[PDB]
Design an enzyme around this catalytic site. Structure first.
Site, PDB file in Angstrom:
ATOM      1  N   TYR A   1      20.769 -19.401 -10.336  1.00 22.86           N
ATOM      2  CA  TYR A   1      21.374 -19.897  -9.101  1.00 22.86           C
ATOM      3  C   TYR A   1      21.916 -21.285  -9.422  1.00 22.86           C
ATOM      4  O   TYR A   1      21.136 -22.203  -9.610  1.00 22.86           O
ATOM      5  CB  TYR A   1      20.310 -19.944  -7.994  1.00 22.86           C
ATOM      6  CG  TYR A   1      20.828 -20.207  -6.601  1.00 22.86           C
ATOM      7  CD1 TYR A   1      21.238 -19.170  -5.775  1.00 22.86           C
ATOM      8  CD2 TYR A   1      20.882 -21.505  -6.095  1.00 22.86           C
ATOM      9  CE1 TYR A   1      21.717 -19.426  -4.484  1.00 22.86           C
ATOM     10  CE2 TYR A   1      21.353 -21.763  -4.820  1.00 22.86           C
ATOM     11  CZ  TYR A   1      21.777 -20.718  -4.026  1.00 22.86           C
ATOM     12  OH  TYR A   1      22.218 -20.983  -2.751  1.00 22.86           O
TER      13      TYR A   1
ATOM     14  N   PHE B   1      31.059 -14.812  -0.209  1.00 29.65           N
ATOM     15  CA  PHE B   1      30.576 -15.770   0.817  1.00 29.65           C
ATOM     16  C   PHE B   1      29.397 -16.490   0.283  1.00 29.65           C
ATOM     17  O   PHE B   1      28.480 -15.863  -0.243  1.00 29.65           O
ATOM     18  CB  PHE B   1      30.160 -15.093   2.123  1.00 29.65           C
ATOM     19  CG  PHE B   1      29.677 -16.076   3.166  1.00 29.65           C
ATOM     20  CD1 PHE B   1      30.576 -16.763   3.948  1.00 29.65           C
ATOM     21  CD2 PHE B   1      28.333 -16.374   3.296  1.00 29.65           C
ATOM     22  CE1 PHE B   1      30.134 -17.683   4.878  1.00 29.65           C
ATOM     23  CE2 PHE B   1      27.899 -17.290   4.213  1.00 29.65           C
ATOM     24  CZ  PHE B   1      28.800 -17.945   5.009  1.00 29.65           C
TER      25      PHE B   1
HETATM   26  O1  LIG Z   1      15.863  -3.396   2.626  1.00 33.44           O
HETATM   27  C1  LIG Z   1      16.006  -4.672   2.049  1.00 33.44           C
HETATM   28  C2  LIG Z   1      16.322  -5.739   3.079  1.00 33.44           C
HETATM   29  O2  LIG Z   1      17.188  -5.209   4.035  1.00 33.44           O
HETATM   30  C3  LIG Z   1      17.108  -6.807   2.353  1.00 33.44           C
HETATM   31  C4  LIG Z   1      16.376  -8.152   2.214  1.00 33.44           C
HETATM   32  O3  LIG Z   1      15.911  -8.823   3.400  1.00 33.44           O
HETATM   33  P1  LIG Z   1      15.273 -10.354   3.522  1.00 33.44           P
HETATM   34  O4  LIG Z   1      14.960 -10.802   4.904  1.00 33.44           O
HETATM   35  O5  LIG Z   1      13.978 -10.482   2.696  1.00 33.44           O
HETATM   36  O6  LIG Z   1      16.379 -11.375   2.886  1.00 33.44           O
HETATM   37  P2  LIG Z   1      17.385 -12.391   3.641  1.00 33.44           P
HETATM   38  O7  LIG Z   1      16.829 -13.774   3.585  1.00 33.44           O
HETATM   39  O8  LIG Z   1      17.996 -11.908   4.894  1.00 33.44           O
HETATM   40  O9  LIG Z   1      18.664 -12.311   2.666  1.00 33.44           O
HETATM   41  C5  LIG Z   1      18.688 -11.520   1.508  1.00 33.44           C
HETATM   42  C6  LIG Z   1      20.035 -11.259   0.824  1.00 33.44           C
HETATM   43  O10 LIG Z   1      21.124 -11.992   1.355  1.00 33.44           O
HETATM   44  C7  LIG Z   1      21.583 -12.944   0.382  1.00 33.44           C
HETATM   45  N1  LIG Z   1      22.006 -14.204   1.005  1.00 33.44           N
HETATM   46  C8  LIG Z   1      21.415 -14.656   2.157  1.00 33.44           C
HETATM   47  C9  LIG Z   1      21.833 -15.836   2.753  1.00 33.44           C
HETATM   48  C10 LIG Z   1      22.865 -16.591   2.186  1.00 33.44           C
HETATM   49  C11 LIG Z   1      23.476 -16.105   1.017  1.00 33.44           C
HETATM   50  C12 LIG Z   1      24.881 -16.547   0.706  1.00 33.44           C
HETATM   51  N2  LIG Z   1      25.611 -15.943  -0.273  1.00 33.44           N
HETATM   52  O11 LIG Z   1      25.347 -17.613   1.516  1.00 33.44           O
HETATM   53  C13 LIG Z   1      23.024 -14.917   0.455  1.00 33.44           C
HETATM   54  C14 LIG Z   1      20.427 -13.111  -0.604  1.00 33.44           C
HETATM   55  O12 LIG Z   1      20.800 -13.535  -1.899  1.00 33.44           O
HETATM   56  C15 LIG Z   1      19.877 -11.699  -0.621  1.00 33.44           C
HETATM   57  O13 LIG Z   1      20.602 -10.853  -1.468  1.00 33.44           O
HETATM   58  O14 LIG Z   1      17.381  -6.238   1.072  1.00 33.44           O
HETATM   59  C16 LIG Z   1      17.211  -4.825   1.135  1.00 33.44           C
HETATM   60  N3  LIG Z   1      17.011  -4.256  -0.202  1.00 33.44           N
HETATM   61  C17 LIG Z   1      16.053  -4.657  -1.096  1.00 33.44           C
HETATM   62  N4  LIG Z   1      16.193  -3.913  -2.214  1.00 33.44           N
HETATM   63  C18 LIG Z   1      17.227  -3.054  -2.046  1.00 33.44           C
HETATM   64  C19 LIG Z   1      17.765  -3.258  -0.775  1.00 33.44           C
HETATM   65  N5  LIG Z   1      18.821  -2.509  -0.331  1.00 33.44           N
HETATM   66  C20 LIG Z   1      19.369  -1.548  -1.167  1.00 33.44           C
HETATM   67  N6  LIG Z   1      18.845  -1.349  -2.436  1.00 33.44           N
HETATM   68  C21 LIG Z   1      17.777  -2.093  -2.885  1.00 33.44           C
HETATM   69  N7  LIG Z   1      17.268  -1.906  -4.102  1.00 33.44           N
HETATM   70  P3  LIG Z   1      14.420  -2.911   3.188  1.00 33.44           P
HETATM   71  O15 LIG Z   1      14.302  -3.313   4.662  1.00 33.44           O
HETATM   72  O16 LIG Z   1      13.256  -3.531   2.429  1.00 33.44           O
HETATM   73  O17 LIG Z   1      14.395  -1.444   3.079  1.00 33.44           O
END
Ligand SMILES: *O([C]1[C]([O])[C]([C]OP([O])(=O)OP(=O)([O-])O[C][C]2O[C]([N+]3=[C][C]=[C]C(C([N])=O)=[C]3)[C]([O])[C]2[O])O[C]1N1[C]=NC2=C1N=[C]N=C2[N])P([O])([O])=O
Lengths: 193, 364, 364
Positions: free
Chosen positions: C57, C299
């Site tokens: 990062y 973004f």
């Molecule tokens: O599916 C998973 C969740 O829906 C999700 C993660 O949720 P979270 O609350 O722990 O994370 P957040 O803090 O909301 O944000 C995570 C992602 O967004 C990016 N981000 C956030 C803010 C600002 C920036 C920016 N560029 O300004 C970026 C951050 O880097 C993260 O990437 O992820 C889902 N998940 C986990 N593994 C997955 C997946 N989806 C598909 N495939 C895989 N392997 P759940 O609810 O657990 O089933």
């Protein structure tokens, strides 16, 4: 190491280097027919030929260092006729206690050398001008000629091969010279008599 | 009355399966005031022509019974070179003997003749006219026949989207030996843009690299070098030492190749995808979007120029000028002459099957 | 003197391997005139915090000996809520009892205390102040501690790039159960945007779908439905019935998920990639670029707001107001209280390891 690798001097230095058994690196600009120019310089005795892009490259530096280590030697001397970035690159390739001689200057570009080389690598940068060096040094001039002569037609040195035009009355003398100046890009012009 | 021949299909499918030849008649004594009869000189086989026949290209001529078939049939081919043989009384923009291309897609160029309106065509100078106008070269039949897709495509991607600073900035492209690739290298030399061409490795790599550099590529790398962790910093140096930036990537391959070229751009880069190597999606690391402000977009010359006669004109005029002045060169096509001893559609079928040999031009 | 604890690392790597706790001293007697001492009330674990520790990062705090270590060490965490406990004699912007967040990234929020200036912080209304200013609600600690990244991220993606017509247009987002996804759904509802949230299938699917619909998602589909050619026409029906278009896609997953949401956009669509929750790259079929004029961009809230303090302030103010008005709720966190019996770094390490359970907040 030398830049202006395809220059007339460049080509002699490569040869003389080979005769004296000095290893050498010639730096040349890139072009579409690179492979052919590279071959021609290596035939004359350039041990290695690189582009100015390679000369510019921090990444490629260690590859040159390997060449020099493999020969159990050191890069002690740089010949600069280009200036600017090119002069910077060839200077960087020298081992500690290196000398650069600047004998020409392609288009506007000053000799540009990193401070660190002068302070930490005992680098010296000087000039070369055959005229001034030999003005009051005929013993040195003739001694050098004697060796060039001996290699000549001991068959060991090859001249650069001029495009000749005979002054045979076909055209006035100055027009012969005027054409060779206009035709400098084809190669070295020799007026014969 | 003129007996003419057209390559048609009544159902989409593979060209090897669905093409046939239809004879039809054109009334040359009955021209409406704005009508024009032309006779084909040559028309190329391009991937989009094939995809159109296949039914997987979302731009295609209507199927009609206007060629005298029982079932509605579509014509084939979108570009080509024609000679004007007759014009109606209100036609001032064209004369018998003139060279023209279609003004729009979906005209149907795999045929011996066509009746249209004068605004269905765009005049190109014939060789006689070019020489009379004092130019050192007239266009070849291949140059006119292939002027409307690939040269315009290269020109527009390079000038219409991001402004590359002459003498400093870079574009990078894959498919370096493609028709568009080779035009883009030449346009980069002509406009003073630096460029990297990415190509596949081959036994005669030395010859191809030299050829591309002569055309105008600044650097040529293999796809192995494009993928190489070791090689990566060498490319960054080329760009950095130039004082410019790598601002534009042209992608016609997809997959790992598209990944590799994307990674070579500076911050705020733009990729244009204008083609794909079969089933390989455009694949871009997430990190380029987030941390390097990368953008990937598409290019389709057909859509860009559909309602932009001004831009099409201006671009075409420059390519014509460069051909006349000897500043632009085409890749040689493999030419097959139609002489009526073999049905026209089979000439096109062979050209489709032989596409790997090189660009196929059917001549007349 | 206050004895504080900070979570530090001296080398990049996985949080389970490199984190430790450092005890350090802050002088809370005889403050300089502009200085401010704060105690942490809570700080979350965001993916960016973890990526920072991992070294992937590109925006991170300097490694220094300033916490009293011999090896240069970096603090952790970019987001958090702090209570002001003492201010210097020239500080009027802040007073004892005030709630604040960091004004800039790289502050190091995984720690018990900090000493900075009043410009290192942004004041949030505390519950007492909100009620006194005649608001029906005040902020909770979780709401304050997570106000700075994820709500602004959702708000800006939805408002700053393409204009969705209220009551008609759609966005589609993956990672629908993410904290960002949950703010997007709510902001969509507040601005009258239709939306589709894509989520991974799970045993308690029905409960999750219900939560997200209540938040504001118009429809919730699984990733299997996202992948489905058969299901596509159903989505098309929804959008057609609305009178609107799917104009924007929000991608934090990558891979096939990114493919699926892109395909669901109307022509001329935009995708913003803001995360990559599997290491899979953004994968887009060539045909979307060429034939549908799709555009894919990035973004990054940190970069967007760097020289855009007016935009930051305006966005934050809207989130605060919505919380005070009872119109927005928080993406809920699992809270772990630090009390001195287990080392602070272990609380955060557990939080990192339990990321899959949902947003984690270490409290104090
Ligand atoms: O599916 C998973 C969740 O829906 C999700 C993660 O949720 P979270 O609350 O722990 O994370 P957040 O803090 O909301 O944000 C995570 C992602 O967004 C990016 N981000 C956030 C803010 C600002 C920036 C920016 N560029 O300004 C970026 C951050 O880097 C993260 O990437 O992820 C889902 N998940 C986990 N593994 C997955 C997946 N989806 C598909 N495939 C895989 N392997 P759940 O609810 O657990 O089933």
């Amino acid at each position: 190491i030398q830049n202006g690798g395809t220059s007339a001097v460049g080509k002699y230095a490569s040869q003389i280097g080979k005769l004296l058994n000095f290893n050498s690196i010639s730096v040349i600009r890139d072009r579409p027919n690179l492979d052919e120019v590279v071959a021609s310089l290596k035939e004359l005795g350039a041990t290695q030929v690189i582009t100015e892009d390679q000369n510019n490259s921090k990444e490629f530096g260690p590859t040159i260092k390997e060449w020099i280590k493999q020969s159990g030697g050191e890069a002690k001397l740089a010949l600069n006729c280009v200036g600017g970035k090119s002069s910077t690159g060839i200077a960087r390739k020298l081992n500690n206690n290196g000398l650069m001689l600047t004998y020409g200057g392609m288009s506007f570009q000053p000799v540009t050398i990193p401070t660190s080389l002068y302070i930490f690598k005992n680098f010296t940068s000087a000039g070369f001008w055959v005229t001034e060096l030999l003005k009051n040094n005929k013993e040195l001039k003739t001694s050098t000629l004697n060796q060039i002569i001996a290699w000549y037609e001991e068959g060991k040195l090859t001249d650069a091969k001029s495009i000749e035009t005979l002054y045979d009355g076909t055209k006035p003398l100055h027009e012969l010279y005027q054409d060779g100046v206009a035709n400098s890009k084809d190669g070295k012009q020799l007026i014969t008599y | 009355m003129i007996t003419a021949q057209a390559v048609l299909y009544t159902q989409h499918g593979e060209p090897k399966d669905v093409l046939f030849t239809q004879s039809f008649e054109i009334d040359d004594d009955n021209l409406a005031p704005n009508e024009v009869i032309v006779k084909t000189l040559g028309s190329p086989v391009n991937p989009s022509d094939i995809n159109q026949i296949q039914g997987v290209y979302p731009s295609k001529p209507a199927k009609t019974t206007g060629f005298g078939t029982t079932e509605p049939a579509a014509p084939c081919g979108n570009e080509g070179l024609f000679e004007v043989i007759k014009v109606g009384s209100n036609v001032s923009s064209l004369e018998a003997g003139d060279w023209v291309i279609p003004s729009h897609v979906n005209f149907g160029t795999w045929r011996t003749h066509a009746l249209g309106n004068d605004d269905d065509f765009i005049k190109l100078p014939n060789p006689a006219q070019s020489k009379a106008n004092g130019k050192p070269n007239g266009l070849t039949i291949n140059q006119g026949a292939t002027i409307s897709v690939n040269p315009l495509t290269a020109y527009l991607m390079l000038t219409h989207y991001v402004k590359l600073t002459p003498g400093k900035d870079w574009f990078i492209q894959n498919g370096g030996t493609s028709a568009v690739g080779k035009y883009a290298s030449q346009i980069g030399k002509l406009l003073n843009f630096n460029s990297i061409s990415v190509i596949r490795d081959r036994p005669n790599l030395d010859e191809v690299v030299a050829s591309l550099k002569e055309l105008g590529a600044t650097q040529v790398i293999t796809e192995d070098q494009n993928n190489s962790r070791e090689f990566g910093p060498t490319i960054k140096e080329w760009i950095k030492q130039s004082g410019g930036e790598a601002k534009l990537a042209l992608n016609c391959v997809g997959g790992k190749s598209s990944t590799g070229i994307a990674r070579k751009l500076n911050n705020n880069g733009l990729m244009l995808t204008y083609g794909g190597m079969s089933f390989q999606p455009v694949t871009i690391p997430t990190s380029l979007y987030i941390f390097k402000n990368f953008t990937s977009a598409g290019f389709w010359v057909t859509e860009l120029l559909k309602n932009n006669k001004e831009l099409k004109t201006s671009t075409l005029n420059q390519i014509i000028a460069w051909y006349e002045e000897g500043k632009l060169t085409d890749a040689k096509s493999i030419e097959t002459l139609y002489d009526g001893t073999k049905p026209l559609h089979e000439l096109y079928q062979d050209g489709v099957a032989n596409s790997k040999d090189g660009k196929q031009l059917i001549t007349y």
